[PDB]
Design a protein around this ligand. Structure first.
Ligand SMILES: [Mg+2]
Ligand SMILES: [Mg+2]
Ligand SMILES: [Mg+2]
Ligand SMILES: [Mg+2]
Ligand SMILES: [Mg+2]
Lengths: 357, 350, 349, 355, 353
């Protein structure tokens, strides 16, 4: 057993070279402190904090942290509120579930990537870039910059221009980076089905790893399934779903080749892992929208896990400042250590400088 | 936790195989699985020739890695796919026992820890009255402290079997779980007829009600046209098949059998899928493992066992079997499966 | 046409069973079926202990009645369902031969009579070059007058297997049918990659491209993301299973194997279901029966056989096989299956 | 056996009108396949024209034994985009049925056995319960069917509220007693909710099935809901054009029984394909009227159910056209071993009403 | 209210059609012509007067849902082609809508949504036999008439043969010309797929009714995914439920449901709503005198279609104030209702009875 004593949270806001997050810590009778920072909610940061303390904490204090199914089942009720954005409870539940897994890993002396399956302990990491207006430099310079940082590739932003114009942008990225570089594209639900199909066929010769959320939100399942069959690039989605059931609907419709369900936005690892299990029955691969501090372990643990993702230092200060023992990228790969739990050494100097109330 | 040796102990007294995974640490993962008789040796052969080579020298802690490479034994297009699934389940279960012990964790908690106690029923009601009349059978199970029974049907007309079910309830009383199993014996209409006739007998569920070829859609119709929850899954070969059952709307409960389909790793995937569908989990017999699997899950239901007269392994091989209390079996905190095998029994038969 | 006796003659020369259904008239229905070796005697046991009791003394002419009664042999929860299905197929194929003879009708015509000729391809391209180089094997099949080959793949990478397939096309030329069979060997992504790579080699179809567990949905994706038609069905246990493949949109062609799942009666049901889906019919090996089955249907495709070096029954069991002409086989008007069995050969059981 | 001539004889006969085309397929041997099908009246001469101008050219000089080959070539008459598709389907059914009769004779086989031979006898019910009581009161009508030896009735509903139609059906069961089959047919007349209401109200009257309970447009899904929310098995298929359509009903879970009408859907060849599909869905087979062919079709299949006819005052053809019609015994009709359809047509009647 | 006082029908043959006119108690007369039913015209005329008129005479033409609901029962007769009743209902529904538009002083394209009042138009051509001249000739001609493109008929030859014909149409017309193809349900799936892949480079707008009728939904969905050209259908469906099925199967990129054949604008507009929830575009099988308004009103409408003058005297003669094509596009006026001015001399010349 591992009895929980109290829940401590540290909301923080940091400037971009703003991004926000909540450090959640679960103290136990044993002295082990499960901790992690999740999400990026900013306008609703303090609302989530209130849910964590007034709604979840009472269901956790004095409880056995190792009875994860039991604790998750009771906390799930925060997602029942009919009067507020369902993501509020889901993020709060995820913040707590993640911190709890970190405590369980430490108690058992097991790194989470191995405790969740241990398929492998290393995977490639790409960067989310290619923003319109090139705030991070020209396409050539941005691509080269990621390669100098030792990244395995990029998830290039599209969905804002015509099929032809974005097709030219993607072409410039492949030309600048060369062949040994992973290139995924993400339209953030911006295209009409026909335009996405057009783009997909235009880039058929560029070796695009996958086409993330190609179409508009309302009928995304069926429409992206058509992008998948009429086009030429594998399709990825799942980050906008609220639950494992939603990801199951995506897979049943045949809308995706990869699911990038975001645990920090949907109830945590416990929820993500269920989605992972469903994916295997569908031969669908697992991805994960950002949140590298937790996705690296989640993805590595599964046989069908793919690639981890991060932002450029200028766009995300947390991954690059919050953890003082981040492994060094080698050949585009990140190898996780055997440190128990998430195994991260948080930079308390940074936390103290940017924590807020 | 490096695996060092794969030891298997086949035996007949009902037949099973005691599989043991030895590690470089003092740990020995062990568990008996399945009840294959005529294929026991073929399975044993797959375990030592095909699986042992993929395990020796490997880390038992990276379960997904091992299961993945061991899965290839289910690919053989020239033999019953069940052979490979059972062999894989034997090794997977033993490895899980080793990991439980290594982490000093009982499997019911390591697998989720939803609860540590659940009711257990017996598989009875066989045609022919090998255990005496219905009334006597029901009383005997109540004497043994069982929570209820999984009553066999599917061999007579609807009115006929409906009468046998009624006899079970009358004799047993209201506080006794009554599940029925047709083992794919009825035509859709007959199952519906039966389901409606027993609508007031508070039947827990109706297991595999219809013939095999179109079971998914046909039992889905028994489900909606009938009056009783439907259960199936023991005949599926993988999580995908159970997923099909759920996608079709054919079941209220899934009783996928881990010892028959790739072990706990496979069963836990099916359980995950069932949560996304709001389907409950059960498990076709094999209490030495189902108690842990089922208790670990928030949607787990009931554990099953045979009457001592029909199964000597559960009752004779585990020296530390929890005492049934008010129909419930509570699991201890012992690591892994936490079972103490009666080696005197083992040596006697093998 | 009362059934008076059920006789079986197990064989090993590759193993099969010669089933003979004797009737009150001088008519004897007969056919050999399945490639069962390890389970041969269990299947023979089913036929005699479970099926014979539902046949002897009954009218061979009332096929649906007999099949309905014998189907129960597939209900056994304690054994490989294939045992019962194979046993049922043996008996069902023999009685159909008997009915064909009684009605003086050749089966290809009695089952529909769409046509009496169809292309014949050889199952080959085995890994390891057991019949020589790719080029030599294709030429060897070409020498035999075969219409094409069902080239084995699913074992190497997309690039590697795609190379082999390319060597086949090159060695054989354009007018030669090339189908490939991965036997459930690839993962969706690899099959899709392979399919796309061979898009210009004019492949007839891609059989069992993916791993078994989620085959239906996974091959449907191979079918839609790939570039070649997909074929499956041989691994299904019944017409319901094939109906499932079709409903999922997994196949362009269904190669349901009659000898593995209840016989012609089951297969003809699957054939009917296929017309409602615009799906074509094929048939996993078993040329001694598939030729009639496939020719009888408007959506039938190609019959298949093994190289003589790998299958001696088709090339030796039947003393009157039609000779291949332009890659095509033409069936005679001989009633029933119309096969003359070599009884000297039979002495190998 | 070579086909030498396609002969058709359209006819009209008074009720208490009803039309049908007798089709005869002459062969070079001494065999003439023949059967009458459909009940088209306003389009009878258009169908007759399709048979002679479009189908005959694909049959004359051809081998009648190659049924799949002929049906395939004849199917093209269903492709005409500018006319009711039923026209071609009925024409095709006419020739296909006559051809099968010819094949059965050539092989000396009754069609019930050639098509499968599951059994040679089945119960026979009468379609009745028409509103306005044209055949007498509910009690008198039911009794009349019992005196004629019928096994039951297919009672017409779908025209009143749930309570009123339920009262009508109750009167049927009360008048007939328990040993009488009672099916109901709404002919697509109710809204889903009303059909469900009726279905639950009659849950204790042991209704065999509920035929086409809801309006046409969304029938598959709506009747599927009547099927699951109600308490009576649901039957449909007669309004479908092809086996593919019946497949759609089955896949949707809309039916327990399929009553695909071979007479206006391409003939026995099409019906038998639907039958095969039905076995894979565990769905039973029925057939909308057309007793002269449904008896053989239904009896041949393991999943076949009941044959149907109309009261003599309602249908003069089944009761006058065949002179060797088996006598109903205990609600059942038993087919003979006579080859083909095995029917002896009444030529006196034909000459009197052919038009 | 806008009380209906009389239903008038003017059947005619010149190609056949029925001009329906709904008289009201105001000073408004709803009018329009629909369908091209020739052998069933009088049968349809009968339904209109014998079945629909009694439900209309003396009713408020402004309550369209009410009137359409009671009229819908003409589609229930299971003893006649369901199209007779659907065509009759459409004729009356369309005339009523024209009356409503006039009463509200609103052109229909704007009353039904008003997305835009301008859209391209192509001609249904490519007939085999060259009834209008060689492939290149016919194409240059549609070009002169100011059409945006053509809907080229196919489905009669092999994949290679029809591909060659399509290739010739593209060759002659050039890049800036819309080219749709229609097989009218004539190919086997494999043939349609073959053809689709062969024309992958000719920029074909869509492939209409590629496969045989019986399993058209699932079969054209496969042509859609195995091929390279978007697929269009719906004209052969009887109702919105039918189009809904097509969309749910994933069979179409575009739905060309024909209002003249299925209950009129009220039904077509329901199909449009359904199409939005599925990201499916709207088209319309001919009937330019009504499809221009229906299509233009919707955010997802595509292109209107017509026949070559040599083939359709009605669209080119019936309407005396037909907008003049410009750059392949036809713009609609603000004239209330359908806003068409019929030539009564032409009507008087070819009206029949
Ligand atoms: Mg994204
Ligand atoms: Mg069971
Ligand atoms: Mg194969
Ligand atoms: Mg009816
Ligand atoms: Mg068209």
């Amino acid at each position: 057993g591992l009895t929980i004593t109290r829940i401590e949270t540290i909301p923080m806001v940091a400037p971009l070279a703003h991004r926000a997050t909540i450090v959640t810590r679960v103290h136990t009778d044993a002295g082990i402190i499960g901790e992690a920072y999740t999400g990026d909610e900013h306008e609703t940061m303090f609302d989530i904090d209130r849910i964590i303390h007034e709604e979840l904490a009472p269901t956790l204090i004095g409880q056995d942290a190792m009875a994860i199914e039991r604790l998750w089942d009771s906390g799930y009720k925060v997602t029942f509120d009919i009067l507020r954005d369902r993501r509020l409870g889901l993020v709060a539940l995820a913040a707590v579930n993640t911190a709890i897994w970190d405590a369980v890993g430490k108690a058992l002396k097991m790194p989470l990537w191995k405790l969740w399956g241990g398929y492998r302990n290393e995977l490639p990491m790409i960067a989310i870039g290619g923003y319109y207006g090139e705030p991070l430099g020209s396409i050539a310079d941005e691509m080269h910059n990621y390669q100098e940082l030792g990244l395995a590739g990029v998830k290039f932003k599209v969905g804002g221009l015509s099929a032809a114009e974005d097709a030219a942008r993607i072409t410039a990225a492949r030309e600048a980076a060369g062949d040994d570089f992973i290139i995924c594209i993400d339209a953030n639900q911006g295209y009409k089905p026909a335009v996405a199909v057009d783009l997909s066929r235009r880039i058929a010769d560029l070796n695009i790893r996958w086409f993330e959320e190609p179409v508009e939100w309302h009928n995304d399942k069926r429409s992206m399934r058509d992008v998948r069959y009429q086009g030429s690039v594998p399709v990825c989605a799942g980050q906008t779903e609220f639950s494992a059931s939603g990801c199951r609907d995506l897979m049943e419709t045949g809308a995706i080749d990869v699911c990038n369900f975001d645990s920090s936005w949907s109830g945590g690892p416990t929820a993500w892992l269920r989605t992972a299990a469903i994916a295997t029955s569908y031969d669908v691969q697992m991805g994960h929208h950002e949140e590298p501090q937790v996705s690296t372990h989640l993805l590595a643990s599964q046989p069908h896990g793919t690639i981890a993702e991060c932002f450029h230092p200028d766009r995300d200060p947390f991954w690059w400042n919050m953890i003082t023992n981040r492994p060094k990228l080698n050949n585009g790969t990140l190898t996780l250590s055997d440190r128990p739990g998430l195994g991260w050494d948080l930079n308390w100097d940074y936390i103290d400088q940017y924590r807020v109330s």
